Symmetry: D2
Subunit: 264 residues, 4 copies
């Protein structure tokens, strides 16, 4: 009767199904997979990447960046929604091969430094290669690259450093306010009386209000289905996409239902 | 045709077979498994741990420490042979639950900081929870805990920070010089013209001479079979144990055979 | 006309005036200087240090710990109010010479990692030896050492990771709720429209309410004069000491006065 | 009688005397001060910086980079001789304002992480803002940027991670092998029986032989006077410049003289 073997982080096959760059606005592109969002913004002074998905997506992201005419050293910045394995996986590998810098809040930085290990809810079950944060950003701080300003909005809940990024692009000259909000889910989390996260409910509730107030005309999420995006249908991907209110209102109802069943 | 799934680091079942503390000398104890060495030294001022094996061995090591009458906060120091997954696995978890400090050279420290990721030979295939080094030690530096002096001897080869630790204990009053030398193997390594390790052959050859010169009366290795230790037979474990010369002489012959076949 | 020379962080002479351990409660002791608070709590399972002052106070703190009958390896934990040079200075040196662990929130951890450099308000003017955080604590998390429970209360303002620690001791059997609240000052800070800290006013105001609500019978601050403590008079030190309300009410009035004059 | 005040790292005024870019070869430029070497190499794919001097030289280096027609985001790499305050000072500030990556060996990386604190010989007397190493390089590893290959040669002595960088440039079409060797001095070091550096003499002696064997036609050093460079005379700067043999032969004679007087 020996000690058990290590277990690998296995996900759905749709999370790893590669797709070609699907255009969102004049400057924003989806270069991830069908069920994992990885946003690429092209400016005149370089490129900015928002999330990257699973650790084995590094080569696929570089192929799509080459498809958009972007060299590795043209990726100037890497922004994260939250530092979990299915979103900040290839960050370490992408920093070594692109010469890019990662900006994240202090809570996302410390979790990125230990590669998702010692997670508040998952422990060491979802460990990915660790990376370091080059620039610590605060709540409401503006990050400007090539004229495009990225505003951070702290929405702690899924992780203590969960962050929503808001910027303004164009839809053929016509401006558009895009909001890439992080997840509001608590899969298997202990909400009531968690010794590792005592103020979790206060952070989740306040984050529900933060998402509703974001300046947004088109919403995206790290998991496209959570905001009713269908990356696999191309042009009609944003057809049934939700609003900030509907996304936060739906996520809050299932949080209170989960909170209610947890008390029983 | 999606991207492949992550693969877990699977080892032989004998590496995870727990055993009770097997006494080596008056103060040194083997508290690991049958095929993974984890040494515990008990002093009057606390305990010192040398290696820990696989990441899922943390609880087993604490159980054997409790069996020897050692509290978690009595573990003062954690010494490493080299920072690979099958030897420094539970180091991060053991630091959180014991209040111990880790001493290692700069090369072992940087590899421990990124949890075995970006390995020179294995890449990201063997990633374990990352840990930090509290004290950077140099070649030949003496680390003293409770009167027992631990002398470090840099033997780079398997890893750039591979280290052999030498201390003197007692066999019922009679002193004994114990040498815990690291591995001299290169499993699947590219020896000739490795762009990640140009001076690898020079480091391996010089490390072969360093092991032969160690002051030793009883030799141990992170893998007991590499020094002909048989932990599963109790008292007769050190029966056929090798010497420093025989251990370095045998490891060098298979290095030159591997070097010869690699050129062809 | 060459570039200017480096300038050292000089403080008032009263900040560096050493004093003997002044007893606060049955287990809490003041072992710092006359104008810099460094609290020592003695339990049956080890000692806990709260702040340490200037970097050159490391030897003085160890002398007072020896005066209280505490060995270096008996210091189990180091807690911080905020990671500035005049409070977390000797933390790096104290970790090397005591075998202690440092617990701090993510914001205090990242500032401690870069040794106070790249400060939001002071830049690189107040740099001290860097240290690492061993345990990341969340808001409201309980840290227990030897039965004495330390509850953290995030009060961001002076620094993004400013923290107040609350524990219950005894005054000769009679229990007492002691609250070690951090500073609420903003010396020379830009409050309105600070690009490095956009939500500073919201954090300061909410921290004013957090201090008023702390369970406290005896209040202490990193600077004793800020809470009307007079360490230099021994027994009568806590004579004119303020309450949580009076301390937060006074600090808020001068914040609004500073905010008013800044707008003009 | 209070504790002493902190002391700032003061240097000679000639170390901080700014100068204009002085051309060395077709691609290598000196953009530091009169007595502190900071080399800039311009390629078609970006720029590479070798050392930077004192921490307050960051703005001056960027001004000279702008003088050479190099944008901040065009600085791709920062290479270090050794991680002391008078050579890796502005590295942290230059990483934040240029988007560059730092490559260094493990020993230079760990010393850069703690900002020169806990020095083997100087303690905490020369602390500078800490920085992180993005890429760990090994002995003899080739670092290529824009076609120009930089070969690292470990020469431990002044610091455990002292490194000499060798690359080949052109003198108007005519190739030239430039070697930027680190210092071989031991100012006030304890050579014989240093508990923090037991194998120091073995490292110094072997580094003396490593410098003599470097492929070099024009030698430079972090301190120009150490290799008989006179940056203040423009074209005649390399007039009396030494060779690799003469530089290592002279440094070894004063090492043995220092070693001889230390024994007495
Ligand atoms: C770590 O990745 C998530 N969990 C898992 O993959 C697995 C699990 O928890 O069942 C383990 C997670 O974050 O919880 C992922 N992410 C999200 C999300 O981001 O909302 C949702 C929804 C759950 O699946
Ligand atoms: C990482 O662990 C080792 N390798 C493996 O477990 C697997 C492999 O390489 O086949 C992967 C390794 O270090 O190479 C282990 N360790 C030793 C050793 O320590 O000598 C020997 C011999 C090989 O097995
Ligand atoms: C960094 O130390 C403080 N500032 C200084 O020492 C100097 C300055 O700012 O004038 C520089 C600071 O934190 O602002 C110290 N600390 C506190 C405090 O902790 O409230 C008060 C009040 C100001 O003096
Ligand atoms: C830290 O900077 C050096 N020392 C000092 O500036 C001062 C000192 O040591 O006297 C302190 C040093 O490295 O020793 C500098 N650097 C070199 C060198 O690089 O060789 C030589 C020669 C001494 O001066
Ligand atoms: Zn997640
Ligand atoms: Zn997810
Ligand atoms: Zn190994
Ligand atoms: Zn192994
Ligand atoms: Zn302060
Ligand atoms: Zn202060
Ligand atoms: Zn130096
Ligand atoms: Zn120098």
């Amino acid at each position: 009767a020996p000690l058990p073997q290590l277990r690998a982080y296995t996900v759905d096959a749709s999370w790893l199904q590669p797709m070609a760059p699907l255009q969102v606005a004049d400057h924003t592109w989806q270069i991830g997979t069908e069920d994992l969002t990885a946003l690429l913004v092209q400016t005149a002074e370089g490129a900015v990447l928002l999330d990257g998905g699973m650790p084995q997506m590094a080569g696929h992201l570089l192929d799509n960046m080459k498809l958009r005419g972007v060299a590795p050293q043209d990726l100037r910045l890497i922004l994260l929604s939250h530092a979990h394995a299915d979103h900040a996986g290839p960050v370490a590998e992408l920093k070594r091969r692109t010469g890019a810098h990662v900006a994240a809040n202090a809570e996302t930085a410390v979790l990125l430094a230990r590669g998702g290990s010692n997670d508040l809810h998952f422990g060491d079950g979802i460990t990915y290669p660790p990376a370091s944060a080059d620039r610590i950003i605060m709540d409401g701080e503006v990050v400007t690259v090539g004229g495009i300003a990225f505003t951070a909005h702290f929405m702690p809940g899924h992780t203590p450093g969960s962050t929503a990024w808001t910027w303004t692009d164009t839809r053929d000259g016509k401006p558009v306010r895009i909001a890439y909000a992080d997840s509001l889910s608590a899969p298997g989390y202990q909400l009531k009386g968690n010794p590792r996260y005592p103020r979790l409910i206060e952070d989740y509730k306040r984050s529900f209000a933060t998402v509703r107030a974001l300046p947004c005309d088109l919403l995206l999420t790290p998991h496209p289905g959570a905001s009713n995006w269908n990356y696999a249908v191309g042009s009609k991907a944003s057809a049934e996409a939700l609003t900030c209110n509907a996304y936060a209102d739906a996520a809050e109802k299932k949080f209170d239902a989960q909170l209610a069943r947890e008390t029983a």
